């Protein structure tokens, strides 16, 4: 039970740790957050 508690807390912390940072590419002006950049990539891949 303690191991499951630690594992679920680690997953919850990791979700925030992954959705926290952003990106900034030279070809794409401005700073793009995780979800916005992911959605833009999904749309570009889908249309191509």
């Amino acid at each position: 039970q303690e191991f499951h508690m630690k594992v679920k807390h680690l997953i919850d912390s990791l979700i925030d740790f992954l959705n926290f940072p952003r990106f900034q590419f030279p070809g794409k002006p401005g700073i793009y957050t995780r979800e916005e950049l992911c959605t833009m990539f999904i749309r570009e891949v889908g249309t191509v």
Partner: protein, 48 residues
Amino acid sequence: DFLNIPLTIPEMRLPYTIITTPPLKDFSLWEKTGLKEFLKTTKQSFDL
């Protein structure tokens, strides 16, 4: 003279991490490091 320019570096965020780099206000490498005062100049001019 470009080195004497106090470039204002904003507070960006490094990707793939949560480490947030501190902003640099009026950053002049030629002056803040103290080289302008030591060499008593803002440029280079040598004659041999």
